């Protein structure tokens, strides 16, 4: 793997979005990975629809939270519309996926990253943006301003985010709380060495889409 990577710089990352006040991070996390792998494979960077997952992927619990596996599987089974055609409404509504006839993006599957292991995660991000989770309950995280975040934070993960890169000592994370949070929407989180739940539990549960 390269010493560092920034998928933003490689053009595989769309502008930061704002999920609030709907607790639909699961959808934002998944969509960002889809946006990323689509660019890597097809050369196209297009903002895709969190609202479709929200309205249509109902194994997850809408604004009350959801799952990486079910949301990734949704895109395998059904593909996903652009954000432009299916915009965010900040709340679950009727699944209108069938009513929309515009451009869609499909994936063919997804892979789970072996958990609690630095290099397994780093190796995955080297290839594509990855869906990851963090413990976001704390003042330090919620009011993060900038720099490499080393703590304080627990490992009781409750928020799904997107790993869009790393450096020697950190993982670059796209958050979904708008561009006014952290570093223009992003947080750089310390790389815990080796076997570890990771800083803020960032090694806990990681998945990435496959577009073959
Ligand atoms: C996170 C957010 O929008 O801030 C959102 O609550 C969420 O989807 N969180 C996930 C985090 C996991 C580590 C992937 C989550 O909690 N998913 C499980 C189901 C949601 C909670 N359960 C119920 N009963 N709603």
From Swiss-Prot:
Pfam families reported in the protein's UniProt record: Peptidase_C1 (PF00112)
GO CC, alphabetical: extracellular region
Disulphide bonds in the chain: 22-63, 56-95, 153-200
GO biological process entries: proteolysis
Protein's cellular compartments: Secreted
A molecular function GO annotation: cysteine-type peptidase activity
Keyword annotations of the record: Disulfide bond, Hydrolase, Protease, Secreted, Thiol protease
InterPro entries, sorted: Papain-like_cys_pep_sf, Pept_cys_AS, Pept_his_AS, Peptidase_C1A, Peptidase_C1A_C, Peptidase_C1A_papain-like
Tissue specificity note: Expressed in latex.
Active site: 25, 159, 175
EC number: 3.4.22.-
Organism superkingdom: Eukaryota
Binding site for E64: 25
Enzyme class: hydrolase
Function: Cysteine protease.
Family to which the UniProt record says this protein belongs: Belongs to the peptidase C1 family.
Name of the protein in question: Mexicain
Species the sequence originates in: Jacaratia mexicana (Wild papaya)
């Amino acid at each position: 793997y390269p010493e560092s990577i920034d998928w933003r710089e490689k053009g595989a990352v769309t502008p930061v979005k704002n999920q609030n006040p709907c607790g639909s991070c699961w959808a934002f996390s998944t969509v960002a990975t889809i946006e990323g792998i689509n660019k890597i494979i097809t050369g196209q960077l297009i903002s895709l629809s969190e609202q479709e997952l929200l309205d249509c992927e109902r194994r997850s619990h809408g604004c009350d939270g959801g799952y990486q596996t079910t949301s990734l599987q949704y895109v395998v089974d059904n593909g996903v519309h652009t954000e432009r055609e299916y915009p965010y409404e900040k709340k679950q509504g009727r699944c209108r996926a069938k009513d929309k006839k515009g451009p869609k993006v499909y994936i063919t599957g997804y892979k789970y990253v072996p958990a609690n292991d630095e290099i397994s995660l780093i190796q995955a991000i080297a290839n594509q943006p990855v869906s990851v989770v963090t413990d976001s309950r704390g003042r330090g995280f919620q009011f993060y301003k900038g720099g490499i975040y080393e703590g304080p934070c627990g490992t009781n993960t409750d928020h799904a985010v997107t790993a869009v890169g790393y450096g020697k000592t950190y993982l670059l994370l796209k958050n979904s709380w708008g561009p006014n949070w952290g570093e223009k929407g992003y947080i750089r989180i310390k790389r815990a060495s080796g076997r570890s739940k990771g800083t803020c539990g960032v090694y806990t549960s990681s998945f990435f889409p496959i577009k073959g």
